Nucleic acid binder design. Structure first.
Lengths: 138, 103, 199, 70, 142, 69, 60
RNA sequence: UAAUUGCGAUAACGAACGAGACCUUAACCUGCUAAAUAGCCCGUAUUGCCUUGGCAGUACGCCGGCUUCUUAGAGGGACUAUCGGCUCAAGCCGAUGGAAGUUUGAGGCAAUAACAGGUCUGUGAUGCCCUUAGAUGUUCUGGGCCGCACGCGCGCUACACUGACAGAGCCAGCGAGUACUCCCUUGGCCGAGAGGCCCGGGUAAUCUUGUUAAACUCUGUCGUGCUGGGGAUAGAGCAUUGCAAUUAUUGCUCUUCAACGAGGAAUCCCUAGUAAGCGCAAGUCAUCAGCUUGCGUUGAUUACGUCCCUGCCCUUUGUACACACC
């Protein structure tokens, strides 16, 4: 029947839920297209996965994404990692993962952060951060 | 015998005591072949109070943080009117319960 | 039409930062290879790497990120590499437009020339200098060069109508040869001279 | 990054008293301890099993001073 | 193909729509102009003489992209920081009468309608169609 | 410590003499080498652009850079 | 001056009043039968390559 | 080795506190139990454009299907796993795999024994002394703790182009909230601004709140000049909190435009989502944050060390001290 797979991507506080669906080759996030949604200097790193792999491998697949929480730079990394999971999981489950295996191998040899998340947060000390106050007298 | 789609809520400080109460309540009801919608568990709210330890003020300045936690875990049901009185018996101590007919 | 139509030529070419391919890097000398890494290229330096976690994990890193990080300092410029990455890429265009050579060639050959080989360490002599003029490692060379280079650009541009982009641009092109009008090379040359004295 | 006497003495007695019943495999070792011992924490339980697998790995090539068994 | 408002550059759309709306030339001006401070946090009036018309595009667009909007929420959307001197800065919201009356006028020209159902004001069918036309023109011109 | 806000004849003919021979042109270079104000430099920039003698590389709210035609 | 290139083969220990200097054994990489020991300031790994201007100090 | 944490040599053998274990919290689970006070798919009605069949939105479903994302319970998972060179061994380092390989990250509790350390201004904990009816008991009016030639400590704003100014694009987390009281406040209306009036929601994953925060990004003005960087000092006027604002509570409106160009001798804090920048919530609170306790955003240079300086503990050593160099 209908073909669709669901994957998510995470950052510090940037959660991006995405459904990768059988389509005809269009990709856009939050409904609005990809053409703009980034700071203008960083938009190349949006193109990372599609550019290295070739657009021909995005022939007939549709994707819709929703992202919220965090900050600007956090969100952009979140959504690109969702792209990788979307394409790899749909192909693995519905076509031969042999192509996936070259895809996955080639994709992570360039950069591993495409499929794995980076865990990093903060912690409450009693000094104003990790540095104490100025000594009253010494 | 007109149903009213009641909802029953619970409150407690403990967690393991309340949780086992929730399972036994659902199974005590289910044994007489009644339909039940499962255990909707409300989020746990955490409230803190920070105070200084020393009572006067000399020496270094050090704090401590006490905490308390609360759980809700309310339940709903579709049932006739007065079967509730027979079934809600045999509750623990401390645990509070409020019933909402939601008519 | 998912991707922008104009930027299409690159796909049929090896990976590059649009305007410049990293292919055909300098052949000038040795002893700084294995410590400048370009063999795995990147488009933009904004990669959140965990280089700090270990000793030499920060040795395996494209030099392009190093320059961007070094530029942001002095309180106001803390964590705002976006201006830094802006300036470096834009400054590359200036020197490319001012000289037919590849800007990566401009940055690489400059940094390999502006590093000292011997220095002096302050061992206790009871107020005096037993400075034996010790040697320097290749890794520290690039570390001190980048740091002192970027400081030269900001101090010059400070309180001037000129901007850092062309100031940094002029700094690299003067350091190509012994111009002596560059912050880096002037302070670089004295270091061996005082070191050569206590040799 | 160094073990203490509690784990080592627990490791020492188990190998000396139940030598045939376990082998170099780390998960088979992991399970046997929880049946034959009385531990109250999963991390301590895991640590004892880890050392015994290290301990048995070295016994196979030459006898060791500490161990003595029938 | 078919396009909509969400398929055009943000700052292009506001400039393109500002030019078209002024050429039509039908909206009230309560005279508040030339005497407004743009908000309790700002110091000088905007430079561009035709700033007031430009603003119209920005507010119309978001009401299309949001479930409901009211006068008070624009205050806290439009606000910014205030240099109180040597003390640290805070966040303060913009002027209320300015935003109020400008959108009063806007809705009198058949772009949106009141929502006594729940509150606020939502755009109306004819207003929605209008924005699409100007956005569509930009695409081919590109 | 003042730069002439208005362009005189002497600067004009020097301008149209050398600006077809420079390798790069910027706001800084004009205020430095030609002893002209920055405001007029941006005005001169746009006027000489439309007459078609310098070519644009990138445009931005902070720096404009142009080379020969 | 005839500058020579050397390669590190064995690290020995960090001397110095505060541990900034390090003793290293180096190889001439052109006359394999020769080997000497020198001092370096910054971080040093194995199989690294160094450039040597003067080859006649040989501190302790 | 972070550790009297361990290996070993040994007239010692086997043990007990402390450390470790322990508990809270942050990271993984397409596997279990789930959820209209959380979501997605699906189905109806419906809006706009291309028209095509779709795309982008609105309202409903409460036995339509599901729990990937959000949220909490039971569990599992890392133990240094496999390796390559040192080495008696305990270990250390380095590569691979993996969400995670500094004790995985951060905290809580915390041994024997002391100090003339601090607190009688926390206590209806408490001895003695003192005062007691012209009260040192309690209560009302006004003032002061803030008064200023001058020395010192914790902080706030700046010395600008890596900037200032004007438009526009636009992304969080931790928390808090009304009964005999007056809390968080949406929407509509009046008001340049501060503020004002009228319906209403929420005792709360339901309403405030998606808290549209600040920083940040794009397009322009200004252009080396203490200038549009800077905002101390003062004049005039308009409101709000409160019984009461003078010694201005604070806010709003217009004007006034000081010193200050990176700071001598000295000296501090800090090793990765850390320093630093930037803001937000809570505490005191009718109003007043430049303060503290917490939360998030952007996000680096340098090291993986030593006993040279400044502290501390263990051994050897000396003593006419033992209330112990006061």
């Amino acid at each position: 029947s209908v073909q669709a797979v669901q994957v998510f991507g995470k950052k510090k506080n940037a959660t991006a839920v995405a459904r990768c669906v059988q389509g005809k080759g269009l990709i856009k996030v939050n409904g609005k297209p990809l053409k703009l949604f980034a700071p203008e200097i960083l938009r190349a790193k949006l193109y990372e996965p599609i550019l290295i792999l070739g657009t021909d491998k995005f022939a007939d697949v549709d994707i819709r994404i929703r992202v919220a929480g965090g900050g600007h730079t956090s969100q952009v990394y979140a959504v690109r990692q969702a792209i990788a999971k979307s394409i790899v999981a749909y192909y693995a489950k519905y076509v031969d993962e042999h192509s996936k295996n070259l895809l996955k191998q080639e994709l992570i040899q360039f950069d591993r952060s495409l499929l794995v998340a980076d865990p990093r947060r903060c912690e409450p000390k009693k000094f104003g951060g990790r540095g104490a106050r100025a000594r009253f007298q010494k | 015998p007109k149903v009213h789609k009641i909802r029953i809520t619970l409150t407690s400080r403990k967690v393991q005591s309340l949780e086992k109460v929730c399972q036994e309540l659902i199974e005590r009801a289910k044994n007489k072949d009644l339909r039940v919608k499962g255990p909707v568990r409300m989020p746990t709210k955490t409230l803190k109070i920070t105070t200084r330890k020393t009572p006067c003020g000399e020496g270094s300045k050090t704090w401590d943080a006490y905490e308390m936690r609360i759980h809700k875990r309310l339940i709903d049901l579709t049932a006739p009117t007065e079967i509730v009185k027979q079934i809600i018996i045999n509750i623990e101590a401390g645990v509070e319960v409020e019933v909402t007919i939601a008519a | 039409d998912v991707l922008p139509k104009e930027v299409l030529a690159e796909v049929g070419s090896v990976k590059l930062f649009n305007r410049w391919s990293y292919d055909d890097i300098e052949i000038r000398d040795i002893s700084l290879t294995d410590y400048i890494q370009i063999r795995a290229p990147v488009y933009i330096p904004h990669s959140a790497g965990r280089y700090a976690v270990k000793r030499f994990r920060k040795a395996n890193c494209p030099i392009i990120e190093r320059l961007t990080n070094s530029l942001m300092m002095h309180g106001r410029n803390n964590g705002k590499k976006l201006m830094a990455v802006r300036i470096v890429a834009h400054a590359f265009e200036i020197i490319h437009l001012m000289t037919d050579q590849n800007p990566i060639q401009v940055a690489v050959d400059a940094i390999v020339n502006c590093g000292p080989r011997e220095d002096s360490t302050r061992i206790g002599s009871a107020g005096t200098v037993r400075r034996q003029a010790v040697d320097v490692s290749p890794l520290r060379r690039v570390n001190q060069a980048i740091a002192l280079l970027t400081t030269g650009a900001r101090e010059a541009a400070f309180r001037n109508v000129k901007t850092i982009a062309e100031c940094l641009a002029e700094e690299l092109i003067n350091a190509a040869k012994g111009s002596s009008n560059s912050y880096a090379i002037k302070k670089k040359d004295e270091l061996e001279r005082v070191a050569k004295s206590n040799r | 990054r160094v073990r203490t006497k509690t784990v080592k003495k627990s490791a020492k007695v188990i190998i000396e008293k139940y030598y045939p019943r376990l082998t170099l495999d780390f998960e088979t070792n992991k399970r046997v301890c929880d049946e034959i011992a009385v531990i109250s924490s999963k991390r301590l339980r895991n640590k004892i099993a880890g050392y015994t697998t290290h301990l048995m790995k070295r016994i196979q090539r030459g006898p060791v001073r500490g161990i003595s068994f029938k | 193909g078919g396009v909509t408002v969400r398929d055009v550059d943000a700052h292009k759309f506001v400039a393109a729509y500002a030019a078209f709306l002024k050429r039509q030339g039908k909206l009230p001006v309560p005279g508040w102009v030339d005497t407004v401070k743009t908000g309790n946090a700002k110091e000088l009036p905007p430079q561009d003489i035709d700033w007031w018309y430009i603003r119209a595009a920005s507010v119309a667009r978001h009401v299309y992209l949001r479930k409901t909007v009211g006068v008070g929420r624009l205050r806290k959307v439009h606000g910014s920081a205030k240099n109180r001197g040597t003390r640290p800065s805070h966040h303060v919201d913009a002027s209320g009468s300015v935003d109020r009356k400008i959108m009063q006028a806007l809705e009198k020209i058949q772009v949106l309608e009141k929502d006594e159902e729940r509150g606020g004001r939502r755009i109306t069918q004819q207003g929605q169609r209008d924005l699409d036309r100007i956005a569509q023109t930009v695409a081919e011109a590109d | 410590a003042q730069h002439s806000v208005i362009l005189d004849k002497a600067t004009s003919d020097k301008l149209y003499k050398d600006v077809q021979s420079y390798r790069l042109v910027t706001v800084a270079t004009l205020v430095d080498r030609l002893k002209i104000n920055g405001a007029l430099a941006r005005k001169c920039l746009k006027d000489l652009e439309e007459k078609g003698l310098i070519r644009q590389v990138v445009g931005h709210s902070k720096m404009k850079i142009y080379t020969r035609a | 001056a005839p500058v020579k290139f050397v390669k590190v083969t064995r690290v020995l220990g960090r001397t110095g009043s505060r541990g900034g200097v390090t003793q290293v054994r180096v190889e001439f990489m052109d006359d394999t039968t020769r080997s000497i020991i020198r001092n370096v300031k910054g971080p040093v790994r194995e199989n690294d390559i160094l450039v040597l201007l003067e080859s006649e100090r040989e501190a302790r």
